[PDB]
Each structure stands twice: as C-alpha cells, then as structure tokens.
A = this chain, B = another copy of it.
Amino acid sequence: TKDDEVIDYIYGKISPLFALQYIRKIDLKHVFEYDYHFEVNGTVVRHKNKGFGYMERFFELKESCDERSKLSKKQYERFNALFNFFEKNGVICMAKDAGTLNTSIEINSLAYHGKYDVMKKFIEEQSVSIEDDYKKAFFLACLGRWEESYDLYSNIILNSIDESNGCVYYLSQINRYRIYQSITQAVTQFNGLGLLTFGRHYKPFTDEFLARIEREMTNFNIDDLFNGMPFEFQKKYKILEFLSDNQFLYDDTVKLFELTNKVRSEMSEGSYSFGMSSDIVVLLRLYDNLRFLYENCLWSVSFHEFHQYIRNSMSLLIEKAEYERTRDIDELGFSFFGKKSGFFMEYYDFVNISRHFKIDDIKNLERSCSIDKIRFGEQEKIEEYLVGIAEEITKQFSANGMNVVFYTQFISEAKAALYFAKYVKLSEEGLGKIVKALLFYFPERDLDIGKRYVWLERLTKCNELPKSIISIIDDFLVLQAEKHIDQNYSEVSSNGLYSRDYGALIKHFEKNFISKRLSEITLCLTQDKQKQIDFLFKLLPLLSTNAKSHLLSFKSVENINDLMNGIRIGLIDEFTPEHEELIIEYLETRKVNYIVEKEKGIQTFSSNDYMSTFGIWYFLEEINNSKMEEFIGMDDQYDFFVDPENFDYKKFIPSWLKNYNDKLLGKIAGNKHMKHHVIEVLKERVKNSNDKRYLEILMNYFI
C-alpha cells in the first residue's frame, strides 16, 4: 500500500549484497525466489508474481521526481543506496517502458591490465583491512608467488571467524582450495616432464610445504562447504550457491552450446535477425562472467575451463562478424542495415584474445577468417600494453632471478600478444622496444630461430622499417656471428630459415647496407675456422667489397650444399659444366641409394631434398645437359617436371602447386602436355575443399 512498505522489502533482500563489488544480472533471479527474470540487457519481466508488484514500484519511483522527496530522510537514504547500487550493475528500466539501451561494462581490476609494477608497489604496504589482505593474496597469486599466498590465505581465514561477515571466509576458502589444486598439478607436471622440457629438474616448493598442505586438506570436500555455513549465510547469500562446485561453468557452457548451435543454423540458412541477435547475448554474457570473476578476486580465472569458454565465445563472435561483412544483397538488406557497422575490436578484445588463446587457435582463426579486414581501434592502449609486456620480459630475463612458476603462467600471453601485434599500428620507439625484446632476451628454448624470423616479418607486415630496427637486427646478427665460434655450436630451426633470411629481410627494404662491424669481424679471420667462414659465406650480400674479395679466397668452392648456398645469394648466375657434373654425381649416388633402399624396402622423405629443383632447372632450360632422362623412377616430381608426356598423372599430389613461384605457374600453363591434367585436379580440389589458395590459382592464372 504505502510506498515505504515497498522500499523496505527491497532493502531487506538486497542490502546484504553490498559485500560483493559485482553481481551478474541473471543471478538476481535467485535472490527473489525466482519471482522475476532479469535479462542480460538489463530489463525486467515478471514470472511468478501474483501479489503486489514490489519490483515495478522501485523503477516507477526512480522515474518519478516529486515522489522521491515524499519519504523520510532515512528512507530517502535507503532509496539513494538502492539507486546507486542498481546503477552500478546496469539495471536500467522494465520491459514495458524499455527503449534503447546501451549497457556499460568496465573492468577496473589491476590483474586484467597487467600492471605488475603497480602490484609490486601495492604488496609492500601494511594492510588496514581484511579486504586489503584478500586483494594482496590474489595479487601474489597472479604474480606467481604461490607459496606465500597459502600463508596469507590461512591468516585471513583464521582471523575472519570473529566477525559478522562470512563472505570473506567463504571466498578465501574457495581460493585456498584452488591454489592447493594448482600447486599439486604444478609439482606433478614438473617432476614428470620438466626434467626433459626445461633441461633440468626444478623444485620450486620445499617438501615441508607440500606435506603440510596435504596434511591440512587430505579430508576436505567442496560440495558440502555451503551446507556447513550458518543458516543466515544459507539464507541471505543464496546468490553464491552456483560457485561452490564446478557446475557453474557447466551451466554457462551448455548455454553457450545452445547459442552456438542457433548462430550456426542462422548462418547456414542465410536469414536476418531483428531486435536482439544471438551474438549480442553471447558478448554480454561473456563480459558479465569476466567482470564477475575478476572484480571479486576469484582465482578460477587461471584455469583451463575458463580459457575454453572465453575462447569459444570469441571465436563464435569473430566468425559471425566475418560472415556479416560478406552476406548477399537479397532485396531487404540496404533498407534495414545500410552502412554496415562492422564489429570493431577494442583494447579489451585484444587483451582477451592475447591472454586466453594459444598459437594453434589463432592460426585456425586465420585460416577461416580474413582477420586483416577487421578494424582495430584504441591503439594507444594497445601500444601501452605491448610496451609493458616487452619491458617485463626484458626485466625478467636480464637479471639472474627467473620465477619458473610465473614463467609457466606468463610466457603464453607474451607469445600470443607479440604474434597478434601484426594487425595493429605501432609507434617508432615502441617498435624498437618490442623488436629488442623479441630478438635479444626472449628465451630460445620455447622460440626457435625460424619462428623468430617469422614473427619479425609478421610485425614488419604493418609498419615500415626505419633505421633503428635495422641497427637492432645488425647488432643481434653480429652477436650470433661471434657466438658461432665454438666447434660444436650448430644451429637448429623448425622451418629451416636460419640467418640467411635475416640477411634477406635486411636487403629487401634497404639496399645499400655496409655493416662495418661484420667487415671488421671478417677482416681478422685468418684460417682454420671452417664453420665460421661457412656462416658468413651466406651473409655475403651484407659485406663490403673488400670483405667480399677477402672471402672469395679459401672459399667453399663447389660442394652441392655450397653450390645451393652460393646460388641462393646470387654469386652464381649461369651454370658451368662443372656444376652439371656435380649434379650428375649427386644423382648417381642417389640412384645407388634408391637401389639399396628398394632392396631393403625403404622410402625416405627429406627437408633437404634437392631432388625437386633439378627438374625445375631442366624444365626452364637452366641446364641443357641431356643425361637427366635416365634417372626416371626416383621421385615423382622429377618425372613430372622432366617428362610431361611420360609421367602417370595419377601420382600427381595436388599439394605441390602451393610451393611454385608465380612465373612457373605462368609457364606451367604454356605447355599442352601439362594443361589437360592439372586443370582437372584443380577443379576437383576447389570443388571438394575450402582452400582459397586453390581457387586463386585456378582463377587468375589458368583461367
């Protein structure tokens, strides 16, 4: 009846929720005994209300003006508190009066933004409240210091008994269980595989600590934690049941599954969606879950299941965005959606993708989405985040002290961030910092030479190359050259790229380099350092004329490896009969090897397979020697290249065409004997597969 009778109930069943900084909107259905629905857009719909509408009156009063003053001063303060709390969580109006809504999301946790230095300042500070200790423990846990976090959690849980607030006790116990689980899995994985992956045995935790934690929680179960809480905590805080077990992520994941199926069906059918689409719901739910789990200092964010959920949500959103840009015109689109408002990727989305993905998932995204067309906004914060990452890497790996525990939790984020930096614009000084961090101080164990060069080119793709980066690369290359002085310092790579590609990258943009340091190094080279002369032989274009003249003496003359290395730099332009003789010698040795293998039933596949370039030379009239025809039957590529009319086209693997340079593909479409057959395999592959490169080859050159 009276307005005071309305507002007192709301305070009575809302006010205890002030201990938490946030509650998700869809969780408010629990605190009202399932009476209403509170949608992810902030609107209100009634479900089981049969009596007076205690919900609608509050929004009626909020909209009204004079009714606000008709209450008492204490009730006016209560209304002010309720209004402030509701505005902080985004509940705007009700469905009947609902107009246009612009939900506000804002993560303020220092953990999300990765400002570790500020965390370091905060930690060395004397706490004045239990909440401060809880925050400090979480900051330590995110910082990798997994040992002291347990002690601070024990202290906060011991000192929280004599206080009328069970929320801190409950949350601290959940966090303690989580850190214990993480410690156990970490030590197990260490003692199992780190002796092989890292090269040594690493034991960050003393045996006493593991024994104590095992003794303390050998007999603890998580499902019955809430039932052991007092009845008041049973009653007021029913909004926190869903966090006790792992059923919460189950309930979110099933909803994501249903939404994903709906979105995929929508995409396949080619329909339109009015009102609220099925992807805005996913985005809002994802952001709500993120800020719930972050602002309230919940440790569940550093586990695999949360990563899977956020990964799937982002992948679905990006796929829908890519499909949106390439939809057909039909006869309805322009009137309803003109001047397409493309899905802009802001700083929050970039941080999410960088933190929660691995390299394989990003590559999978790149193979099925033209991610370079997507706009990238708010670039200053992207630059700040990237520079902070680079500085943290440099600081961590420059000193003698490396935190292995924090190394496992951080190296993936830095890896993914420096990979994804390809599609965004960078400042010059920031580019210098990032390139220095990627080249010098990034560990070699996890990142190889070829991977480093590929990453450097990826970062080069969007920004030009000024002189500072050239000097940085020159310094690292000189360091690598001088390190290659021990008799056993062989180099390895996963893509077979090595330092030759570094030289090529330098030469591609700037053309008249001198590199005085390398000239000084080579001028003092006397003799008897075979691998040292071989190393900078492939570095010849970056050397001086006098250095070149010095190097031409005691040169690795004509060996097949040396022949290919020298012809890859341009030292040899046209073949000589000696080169043909060496090619024939290699072919004859390979034929004897093939006879031996056939006797033994052995087949070999090599990344150093020179067997294929010989047919390439023969087909383009590089070599006029006519004794190649006797080596038919060794490898399929040789037969295809040299005898187009004799090769059986059934063996023609269609993955070969990807590696051909464009002028071959122009020349491959000139001879009659290779036009009737390659066309058919091209059509079959383009029809039965979604590879766009095959379509490009079929379209531009053959047709």
**Quick one: which of B328, B331, B368 contacts A685, CB cutoff 8 A?**
B328
In chain A between 353 and 404, which residues have their CB closer than 8 angstroms to a CB of chain B?
A: 360-361, 364, 367-368
Flag the segment in A248-256, A492-500, A535-543, A594-602 that touches B: A248-256
Residues of the B chain whose Cβ atoms lie less than 8 Å from the Cβ of A293: none
Residues from chain B with a CB closer than 8 A to the CB of A253 are 254, 257
- Please give me the residue from chain B that is nearest to A260 by CB atom: B257
Kindly state whether residue A103 has any CB partner on chain B within 8 Å: no
Evaluate whether A364 and B699 lie within 8 angstroms (CB atoms) in the complex, with A251-B250, A326-B688, A329-B654 already known.
no
Interface residues of A (CB under 8 A from B): 247, 250-251, 253-254, 256-258, 261, 265, 268-269, 308, 312, 325-331, 360-361, 364, 367-368, 603, 605, 653-655, 683, 685-690, 692, 695-696, 699, 703
A637 CB to nearest B CB, Å: 11
CA distance A703 to B699 in the complex (A): 10
Contacts of A653 in B (CB 8 A): 328-331
Distance in angstroms from A303 CB to nearest chain B CB is 14
Q: A250-B251, A253-B257, A257-B257 are in contact. Are A686 and B690 (CB under 8 A)?
A: no
Query: Cα distance A654–B333 when bound, in Å?
Result: 14
Known contacts A247-B250, A253-B257, then 7 further A-B pairs from the complex at CB < 8 Å, ordered by chain A residue = A250-B254, A256-B257, A257-B257, A257-B312, A326-B688, A328-B689, A687-B695
Which of B257, B329, B695 contacts A686, CB < 8 Å? B695
**Among A247, A265, A325, A329, which residue has the most Cβ atoms of chain B within 10 A?**
A329
Name the prevailing secondary structure of the A interface residues.
helix
In the bound complex, how far is the Cα of B256 from the Cα of A254, in angstroms? 10
Q: Measured between alpha carbons, how far is A271 from B344 in the docked complex, in Å?
A: 33
Contact present for B328 and A654 (CB under 8 Å): yes
Interface centre among A254, A325, A361, A686 (most CB of B within 10 A): A254
Q: How far is the CB of A417 from chain B (nearest CB, A)?
A: 22
- Nearest CB in chain B to that of A311: its residue: B261
B655 lies within 8 A of A367 (CB): no
> In the complex the two chains form, is A364's CB within 8 Å of B268's CB?
yes
User: Does A326 contact B689, Cβ atoms closer than 8 Å?
Assistant: yes
Given the known inter-chain contacts A686-B695, A687-B692, A688-B326, please indicate yes or no for A603 contacting B261, CB distance below 8 A. Answer: no
Question: Can you list 8 A-B pairs, Cβ within 8 angstroms, ordered by A?
Answer: A253-B257, A257-B312, A265-B360, A268-B364, A268-B368, A326-B688, A686-B695, A703-B703
Cβ of B654 and Cβ of A331 under 8 Å apart?
A: no
How far apart are the CA atoms of A692 and B327 in the complex, in Å? Answer: 15
Cα A605 to Cα B329 in complex, Å, equals: 14
Contact A328 B692 (CB under 8 A): no
How far, in angstroms, from A328 to B684 measured CA to CA in the complex? 11
Q: Which residues of B contact A692 (CB under 8 A)?
A: 687
Residues of B within 8 A of A328 (CB): 653-655, 685, 689
Tell me if B265 and A364 are in contact (CB < 8 A). yes
Q: In the complex, which residues of chain B have a beta carbon less than 8 angstroms from the beta carbon of A361?
A: 265
* Given A326-B688, A364-B268, A331 and B247 contact (CB-CB distance below 8 Å): no
Smallest distance from the beta carbon of A573 to chain B beta carbons, Å? Answer: 33
Could you tell me the distance between the alpha carbons of A699 and B688 in the complex, rounded to whole angstroms? 13
Which of chain B's residues have a CB closer than 8 A to the CB of A331?
603, 605, 653
Interchain CA distance A326-B683 in the complex, whole Å: 13
How far is A325 from B253 in the complex, measured between Cα atoms in Å?
A: 31
Residues of B within 8 A of A326 (CB): 688-689
Write out the residue numbers on chain B whose beta carbons fall within 8 Å of the beta carbon of A312.
257, 261
In angstroms, how far is the closest chain B Cβ from the Cβ of A306?
13
A686 to B692, CA, bound (A): 10
Q: Which 5 A-B pairs have the closest CB atoms?
A: A326-B688, A257-B257, A268-B364, A253-B254, A250-B250
Which among B269, B325, B368, B695 is the interface contact of A364 at CB below 8 angstroms?
B269
Q: Which residues of B contact A685 (CB under 8 A)?
A: 328
Question: Complex Cα distance A88/B688, Å?
Answer: 43
Least Cβ–Cβ distance between A31 and chain B, in angstroms? 19
CA distance A522 to B393 in the complex (A): 92
Q: Which residues of B contact A683 (CB under 8 A)?
A: 699
Nearest-Cβ distance from residue A464 to partner chain B, whole angstroms = 29
Q: Give every chain B residue within 8 A of A605 (Cβ-Cβ).
A: 331
Taking the nearest CB of chain B, how far is it from the CB of A342, in angstroms? Answer: 15
Query: Which residues from B are CB-within-8-Å of A367?
Result: 268
In the complex formed, the residue of B with least CB distance to A367 is B268
Once the chains are docked, how many angstroms separate the CA of A632 from the CA of B603? 70
Nearest Cβ in chain B — how far from A385, in angstroms? 27
Contacts of A688 in B (CB 8 A): 325-326
In the complex, chain B residues whose CB is within 8 Å of the CB of A325: 688
Residues of B within 8 A of A251 (CB): 250
CA distance A574 to B308 in the complex (A): 67
Least distance between A248 CB and chain B CB atoms (Å): 11
In the complex, what distance in Å separates the CA atom of A331 from the CA atom of B699? 26
CB distance from A640 to the nearest CB of B (A): 14
